[PDB]
Paper text:
The spike (S) protein of coronaviruses is responsible for interaction with cellular receptors and fusion with the target cell membrane. The S protein of SARS-CoV-2 is a large, 1273 residue, type I fusion protein, that can be processed by host proteases into two parts, S1 and S2. The spike (S) protein of SARS-CoV-2 has been observed in three distinct pre-fusion conformations: locked, closed and open. To overcome this challenge, based on the locked SARS-CoV-2 S-R/PP structure, we engineered cysteines residues replacing positions D427 and V987 to generate a new disulfide-stabilized S protein S-R/x3.
Consistent with the predicted effect of the engineered disulfide bond, 3D classification of S-R/x3 particles showed that the majority of the particles (76%) are in the locked conformation, while 23% of the particles are in the closed conformation. Further 3D classification after symmetry expansion revealed that locked S-R/x3 spike protomers adopt two distinct conformations that differ primarily at domain D, we will refer to these conformations as “locked-1” and “locked-2”. Classification revealed that locked S-R/x3 S trimers were formed by all four possible combinations of locked-1 and locked-2 protomers (the combinations 111, 112, 122 and 222). In the locked-1 conformation, residues 617–641 in domain D form a large loop, of which residues 632–641 can be clearly identified in the cryo-EM density while residues 619–631 are disordered and not resolved. In the locked-2 conformation, residues 617–641 in the locked-2 protomer are ordered and can be clearly identifiable in cryo-EM density. We observed density consistent with the presence of the pigment biliverdin in the reported NTD binding pocket in all our spike structures, consistent with the greenish color of the purified protein.
Author numbering:
A (entry chain B): 713 to 830, 834 to 1140
B (entry chain C): 559 to 676, 689 to 762
C (entry chain C): 962 to 1140
The structure:
């Protein structure tokens, strides 16, 4: 069965690249604002020097996780003012200059589909506190969320540079300096990559372009329909917030003390007896902080794995063409287009998918006059009467010829060989 | 506050609202300190100068947020001055804002990076994303390489870390037999 | 881990000998139990952190093994998997607790502009190159390999024909040499 047509399918896959950087203050979390408790916490200071190290190790890592995913190329390319790509339309993915930022349409849709309910200006919390904002409680308990190093506009600039390089130079900009190439010729290179001769592209270029454009449209309404697709990223947000909330809730435990309120202990008991109770509370809250930091390290490792995968996909599919099966979309990979998303990346893998198969009769070789003929590249296909050489991924039959095939020995040992003449120019 | 209530408590169980017994009004208690102060510094053996980034505060209201009135005079210099600079992350004190852009030396955040430059001081600038290079494009123009370079790059990868073993007995219980006897019931933990 | 042995953990002292010399076994056992619990907690924290770092190192070592297989023992077509540029070879070098790969790569150096066309209409039939592209220095056209400027005259063996020359967008007129 040989395909006689194709479809240009655009598949969207989302990968979390980083998570919210966080910092913790032992002193104001455990021993809120009392000097009596904080004096007892000095002997445990080493433990915090561990904790503040580990969280710091996470925070820097997240910045690195973004960098190695987006800072592949340090040459910030700009798309040309003229959009002449052989009928291909990149408006929905290229930057839109009519916005304060450079986010494309698809990037805007992705951003609007993730909440990211986190900046609260310290001073708003000192005002309308009766609303009981979660972030205000976190900030009063010493749980601060550091901001990402790379601003969203800057990540969008990196994505725009990658897109411009990909469409204006193909993979040549990945392996050093960018080199010009008309987009149709680039697509011809890609088609040669997947094992279908380039002559089909120029014979169906408009159609292909139309299909590509249609596929892009199918992404837009798909991203503007429901937010479930970005569930990978939203979870990565929500979970982190969940953890912080749990931490605050975990301050409501006695841990064997007479009460969970430090001031209550210091008001009922004196320094005579309050020291043991405060020590119990300190040990419990330090254990809670250790649990939080360990869970954060687990999640940081998971996010590092995801970001390494994202960087590999950026290198092997955006900057090149991947021959790995299913690595970049279902089908035969042609290109990829990156799109920034909150704490993640989105890949639009465009793929060649054969569409209309058709039954055919084939033989492994052709015996012309004793010698067996094997095709240089392709298969022998018969429509019922004659035979032709056809490329594997497309139905482009042509008459058997001495240059289409090569001879190897006599035609007695090959099982399934048939009888036919071969044209000799 | 219902008439039988005097103290209000938040999710953390720490009292936050109190009914003042003398004047029958409700007052809220908030921490007199806060977290978010970050110290930016070149490595000592270079200089003792430092900058201070206060997170999620305008530098107009830093004195009340930090309560600079009760702080030492050495802290008040970092509360207000001519080196005030605002960022999306927060606002920065002790660093001179520079419109020029360089590579990131000491990342601050929100695309702002700091460095120690020249009279030596600390500058804070919006980091650059590398060289700007527009690429020509035409529907009938290509670029072909006529020459090449054989470039040898190096990359290092960790393979293993130090194998380590721990003796519970001599760590927890140096040489006392009493402690070693008391540690038997926790053997299931140590064997883990 | 060594430094964390200087914590009371709620005991009267962080030294077993002080507790055992001030208190008899009557009251010393509760203090020693508190110390044991705290030090066991410290050991568990250390072991958990070591497991995290071991996971990191295992990921790095899996990557190193994959690089050794796919670049030292072969030629990797994956882009930027082994150095920047097109991969030629790789040489390993042991280092303490790690490996160092020397990735020798091919990087095109000096680029030249050339006017190109997707195909060539010889006498109505369009010609497409087998391996290369059509490049014109201004007057004539040549088939050149993509990664190096090695022009050669258009020829029937260099190219192949498929259909008339009206459907291709951007085709140009030229002759093809027939040996
Ligand atoms: C290959 O598949 C495409 C699917 O689009 C076919 O193009 C469609 O053909 C029908 C009938 O002519 C039209 O109604 C549609 O408008 C076309 N769609 C597009 C996007 O162009 C194409 O005809 C098929 N080619 C072959 C040889 O079967
Ligand atoms: C590429 O696709 C868009 C469809 O989204 C084409 O039409 C434009 O769509 C945007 C949507 O906001 C409108 O603002 C424009 O007014 C539309 N312009 C036109 C001429 O229809 C767009 O035309 C396509 N690109 C090209 C070069 O045709
Ligand atoms: C393909 O061609 C060859 C010769 O042209 C055929 O070989 C003959 O087959 C018949 C039947 O077995 C024999 O009686 C002849 O002696 C063979 N002649 C030669 C020169 O080999 C062969 O049969 C043909 N293939 C098929 C399936 O018929
Ligand atoms: C291609 O590049 C190499 C260098 O990368 C050129 O070789 C140099 O040529 C100049 C002049 O002949 C010499 O001064 C250098 O010593 C050469 N360098 C080396 C390492 O050999 C080479 O000439 C270039 N070839 C072309 C066609 O441009
Ligand atoms: C390429 O070759 C074809 C065949 O010779 C040219 O076809 C005709 O050329 C004459 C003048 O040389 C024109 O009057 C005709 O209009 C052409 N035929 C058609 C259908 O247009 C063709 O002109 C050549 N291509 C170019 C761009 O000149
Ligand atoms: C090809 O032939 C088989 C057997 O008759 C049949 O089951 C199958 O549906 C056919 N496929 C097409 C595309 O005709
Ligand atoms: C098979 O192909 C040949 C050449 O195109 C044609 O003459 C013949 O009619 C075709 N036969 C069938 C059954 O399609
Ligand atoms: C293919 O299968 C059929 C049925 O088993 C058999 O008759 C035929 O000999 C097979 N083809 C060859 C070359 O043996
Ligand atoms: C005494 O208590 C009453 C009732 O709380 C209050 O109105 C008053 O202000 C307080 N002070 C004096 C001097 O009465
Ligand atoms: C703080 O700075 C921001 C800048 O947009 C401004 O919106 C806000 O009103 C300022 N708040 C105060 C109290 O100055
Ligand atoms: C830097 O940019 C600001 C924009 O408000 C401008 O006011 C200032 O004059 C500039 N300073 C220099 C040295 O360019
Ligand atoms: C190739 O052409 C473009 C536009 O004409 C030009 O910007 C570029 O510099 C040229 N390449 C070289 C190496 O000069
Ligand atoms: C282009 O190449 C041909 C090769 O014969 C040469 O004759 C001609 O002078 C060259 N023209 C230019 C502008 O380089
Ligand atoms: C290529 O671009 C030029 C000007 O931009 C235009 O005149 C010409 O029609 C275009 N040709 C093709 C095949 O796109």
């Amino acid at each position: 069965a040989i395909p006689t047509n194709f479809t240009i399918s655009v598949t969207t896959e989302i990968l979390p690249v980083s998570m919210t950087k966080t910092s913790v203050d032992c002193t104001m979390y455990i021993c809120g604002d009392s000097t009596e408790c904080s004096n007892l916490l000095l002997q445990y200071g080493s433990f915090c020097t561990q904790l503040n190290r580990a969280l710091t190790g996470i925070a820097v890592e997240q910045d690195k996780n973004t960098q190695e995913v987006f800072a592949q190329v340090k040459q910030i390319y700009k798309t040309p003012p003229i959009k002449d790509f052989g009928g291909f339309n990149f408006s929905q993915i290229l930057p839109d200059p009519s916005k304060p930022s450079k986010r494309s349409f698809i990037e805007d849709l992705l951003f609007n589909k993730v909440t990211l309910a986190d900046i609260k200006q310290y001073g708003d919390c000192l005002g309308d506190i009766a609303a009981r904002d979660l972030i205000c409680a976190q900030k009063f308990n010493g749980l601060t969320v550091l901001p990402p190093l790379l601003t969203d506009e800057m990540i969008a600039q990196y994505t725009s540079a990658l897109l411009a390089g990909t469409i204006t130079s193909g993979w040549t900009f990945g392996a050093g300096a960018a080199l010009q190439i008309p987009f149709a010729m680039q697509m011809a290179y890609r088609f040669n990559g997947i094992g279908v001769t380039q002559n089909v592209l120029y014979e169906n270029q408009k159609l292909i372009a139309n299909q590509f454009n249609s596929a892009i449209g199918k992404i837009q309404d798909s991203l503007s329909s429901t937010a479930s697709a970005l569930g990978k990223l939203q979870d990565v947000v929500n979970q982190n917030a969940q953890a912080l909330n749990t931490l605050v809730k975990q301050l409501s435990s006695n841990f064997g003390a007479i009460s969970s309120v430090l001031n209550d202990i210091l008001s009922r008991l004196d320094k005579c007896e309050a020291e043991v109770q405060i020590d119990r509370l300190i040990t419990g809250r330090l254990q809670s902080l250790q649990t939080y930091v360990t869970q954060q390290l687990i999640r940081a490792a998971e996010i590092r794995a995801s970001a390494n995968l994202a960087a590999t996909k950026m290198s092997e599919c955006v900057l090149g063409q991947s021959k790995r099966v299913d690595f970049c979309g279902k089908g035969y990979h042609l290109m990829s287009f990156p799109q920034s998303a909150p704490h993640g990346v989105v890949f639009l893998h465009v793929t060649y998918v054969p569409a209309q198969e058709k039954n055919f009769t084939t033989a492994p070789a052709i015996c012309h006059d004793g010698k067996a003929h094997f095709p240089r590249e392709g298969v022998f296909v018969s429509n019922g009467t004659h035979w032709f050489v056809t490329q594997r991924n497309f139905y482009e039959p042509q008459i058997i010829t001495t240059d289409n095939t090569f001879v190897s020995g006599n035609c007695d040992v090959v099982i399934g060989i048939v009888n036919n003449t071969v044209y000799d120019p | 506050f219902l008439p039988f209530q005097q103290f209000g408590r938040d999710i953390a169980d720490t009292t936050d609202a109190v009914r003042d017994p003398q004047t029958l009004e409700i007052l809220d208690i908030t921490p007199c300190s806060f977290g978010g102060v970050s110290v930016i510094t070149p490595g000592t053996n270079t200089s003792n100068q430092v900058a201070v980034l206060y997170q999620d505060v305008n530098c107009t209201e830093v004195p009340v947020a930090i309560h600079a009135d009760q702080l030492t005079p050495t802290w008040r210099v970092y509360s207000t001055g001519s080196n005030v600079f605002q960022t999306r992350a927060g606002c920065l004190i002790g660093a001179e804002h520079v419109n020029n852009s360089y590579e990131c030396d000491i990342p601050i955040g929100a695309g702002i990076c700091a460095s120690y430059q020249t009279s030596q001081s600390i500058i804070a600038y919006t980091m650059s994303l590398g060289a700007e290079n527009s690429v020509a494009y035409s529907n009938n123009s290509i670029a072909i390489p006529t020459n090449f370079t054989i470039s040898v790059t190096t990359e290092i990868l960790p393979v293993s870390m130090t194998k380590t073993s721990v003796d519970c007995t001599m760590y927890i219980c140096g040489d006392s037999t009493e402690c070693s006897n008391l540690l038997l019931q926790y053997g299931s933990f140590c064997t883990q």
